[PDB]
Amino acid sequence: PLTALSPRRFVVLLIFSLYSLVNAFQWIQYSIISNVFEGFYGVTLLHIDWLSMVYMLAYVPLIFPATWLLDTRGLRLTALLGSGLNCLGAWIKCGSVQQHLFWVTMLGQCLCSVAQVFILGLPSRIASVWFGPKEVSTACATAVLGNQLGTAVGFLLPPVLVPNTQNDTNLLACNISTMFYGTSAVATLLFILTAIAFKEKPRYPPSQAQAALQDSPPEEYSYKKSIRNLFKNIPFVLLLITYGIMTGAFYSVSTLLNQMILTYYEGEEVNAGRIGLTLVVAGMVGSILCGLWLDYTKTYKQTTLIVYILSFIGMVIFTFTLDLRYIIIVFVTGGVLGFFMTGYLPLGFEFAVEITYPESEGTSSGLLNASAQIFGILFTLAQGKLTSDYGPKAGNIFLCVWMFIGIILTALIKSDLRR
Numbered sequence: 001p002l003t004a005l006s007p008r009r010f011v012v013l014l015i016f017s018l019y020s021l022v023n024a025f026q027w028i029q030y031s032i033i034s035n036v037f038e039g040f041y042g043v044t045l046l047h048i049d050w051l052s053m054v055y056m057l058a059y060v061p062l063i064f065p066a067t068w069l070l071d072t073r074g075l076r077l078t079a080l081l082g083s084g085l086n087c088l089g090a091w092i093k094c095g096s097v098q099q100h101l102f103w104v105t106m107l108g109q110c111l112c113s114v115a116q117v118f119i120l121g122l123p124s125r126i127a128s129v130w131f132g133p134k135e136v137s138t139a140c141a142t143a144v145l146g147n148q149l150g151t152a153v154g155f156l157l158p159p160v161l162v163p164n165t166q167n168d169t170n171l172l173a174c175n176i177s178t179m180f181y182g183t184s185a186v187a188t189l190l191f192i193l194t195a196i197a198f199k200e201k202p203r204y205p206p207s208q209a210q211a212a213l214q215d216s217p218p219e220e221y222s223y224k225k226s227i228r229n230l231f232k233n234i235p236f237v238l239l240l241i242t243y244g245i246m247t248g249a250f251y252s253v254s255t256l257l258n259q260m261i262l263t264y265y266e267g268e269e270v271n272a273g274r275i276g277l278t279l280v281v282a283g284m285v286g287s288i289l290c291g292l293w294l295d296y297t298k299t300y301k302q303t304t305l306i307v308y309i310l311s312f313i314g315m316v317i318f319t320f321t322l323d324l325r326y327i328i329i330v331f332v333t334g335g336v337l338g339f340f341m342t343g344y345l346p347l348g349f350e351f352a353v354e355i356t357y358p359e360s361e362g363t364s365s366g367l368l369n370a371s372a373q374i375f376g377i378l379f380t381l382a383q384g385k386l387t388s389d390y391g392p393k394a395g396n397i398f399l400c401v402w403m404f405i406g407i408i409l410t411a412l413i414k415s416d417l418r419r
């Protein structure tokens with residue numbers, strides 16, 4: 001069949017990244033300056049942590065229905081839903097700048113959480129539908145890097161945008177309103193652009209494989225049967241548990257980073273955001289390097305196990321070096337830990353995909369993400385309680401123990417797959 005590539009693809013991809021990026025920002029805007037918000041709303045730190053945990057909670061039940069909707073109705077509807085939900089949540093947050101309106105901010109965060117479900121699955125679908133065979137991998141990498149950059153910007157900007165001024169409540173409200181209004185304006189512009197230019201599919205197929213897929217009639221897929229078959233594979237279950245543990249540890253560290261840093265470094269919220277951004281950027285670099293290393297070696301289990309062990313070592317180093325009262329040490333430790341942790345994620349994801357080659361990639365991706373969300377919620381709750389009661393060291397040691405368990409599980413995995 002005739003195959004052509006149009007410039008619109010890039011626009012589409014760009015737009016997606018942007019309205020993915022903002023979403024990631026909204027995930028971590030509250031946590032990085034949680035203490036300040038704790039002062040503004042007169043709530044507990046658990047209230048602020050739930051603003052991060054709602055993203056994880058919403059994904060698990062709605063992912064599979066969201067995947068079914070994406071398959072049945074196409075990419076355009078999913079993109080529109082995600083962008084509109086993000087914009088509406090941003091506006092609701094804009095309407096929540098008051099000491100007695102924490103529930104409005106929670107509603108906005110819930111809307112953004114529902115939006116996230118419609119965004120995480122779009123990268124590969126867009127890359128296939130709009131990009132040629134050579135550019136699929138690069139398009140997907142850019143799409144995911146958009147969300148990761150959004151997380152980094154959420155780590156960095158809010159500390160600067162909203163200085164901690166409990167003495168002056170009006171100034172704090174003004175800064176919070178400014179941040180919310182900026183996010184809302186960006187989200188609204190991105191939603192308008194998605195509506196205007198986010199077409200369902202290109203005029204001509206981008207590749208022969210996509211041409212065959214579009215030409216081929218749709219086929220019914222049993223998500224429940226696929227999940228049951230996937231759970232039958234013990235190696236897949238072990239890899240799911242390990243990936244969930246790693247991603248949940250990352251989420252817990254991100255959510256509670258401000259609480260950990262403020263314990264020993266008071267008045268360093270900006271430095272905490274810088275540490276988070278360094279962690280995320282080192283994670284991006286480590287992900288790229290690990291992808292290249294896996295491509296060159298063609299080894300999955302060995303590379304994944306080495307990366308897991310290095311992540312555990314970095315976690316231990318960060319755990320037992322936070323109290324030295326040297327901010328630069330925290331910077332370096334967080335950079336190394338993010339490098340290794342984020343490098344693990346693509347390796348484990350690709351290992352899961354190849355282990356379950358007969359099964360659909362979408363179902364395995366949904367299972368991996370749901371395990372990540374569940375482990376993130378559990379780790380966030382446990383580590384927050386440990387930090388509140390016994391101090392950050394207890395929660396960090398808890399994370400290290402879970403990482404050791406994950407290392408054991410990864411070692412136990414049996415796989416002859418090579419690639």
Ligand SMILES: CC(C)CCC[C@@H](C)[C@H]1CC[C@H]2[C@@H]3CC=C4C[C@@H](OC(=O)CCC(=O)O)CC[C@]4(C)[C@H]3CC[C@]12C
Nearest residue numbers: 044046047048050051054057058106109110111113114
């Ligand atoms: C629509 C989808 C995205 C699901 C929406 C679920 C949320 C609205 C729920 C899930 C868990 C809930 C939280 C579960 C536990 C708590 C702790 C709870 O704390 C207390 O009551 C004690 C506070 C104190 O120690 O003084 C306050 C409500 C809160 C944050 C809840 C707020 C509402 C949450 C975030």
Ligand SMILES: CC(C)CCC[C@@H](C)[C@H]1CC[C@H]2[C@@H]3CC=C4C[C@@H](OC(=O)CCC(=O)O)CC[C@]4(C)[C@H]3CC[C@]12C
Nearest residue numbers: 060061062064065223224227240241244367370371374
């Ligand atoms: C990683 C470990 C720690 C937790 C693994 C939990 C999963 C087995 C859960 C998480 C989300 C669940 C799904 C959430 C929603 C649905 C939709 C639900 O839809 C229906 O009720 C109709 C199904 C049909 O059309 O037959 C079917 C079960 C399913 C796929 C659930 C199956 C079980 C899942 C995959």
Ligand SMILES: CC(C)CCC[C@@H](C)[C@H]1CC[C@H]2[C@@H]3CC=C4C[C@@H](OC(=O)CCC(=O)O)CC[C@]4(C)[C@H]3CC[C@]12C
Nearest residue numbers: 382386389390391393394395396397398399401402405
């Ligand atoms: C796989 C799952 C089921 C493992 C769960 C293990 C947890 C129950 C462990 C992991 C980290 C442990 C904590 C690590 C460090 C400490 C500090 C320790 O502090 C003290 O009061 C004694 C030492 C001191 O004086 O500092 C008290 C126990 C506690 C909270 C530990 C309690 C038990 C925890 C939470």
Ligand SMILES: C[N+](C)(C)CCO
Nearest residue numbers: 024027052055056251
């Ligand atoms: C996937 N994110 C990191 C964007 C949110 C986790 O709840």
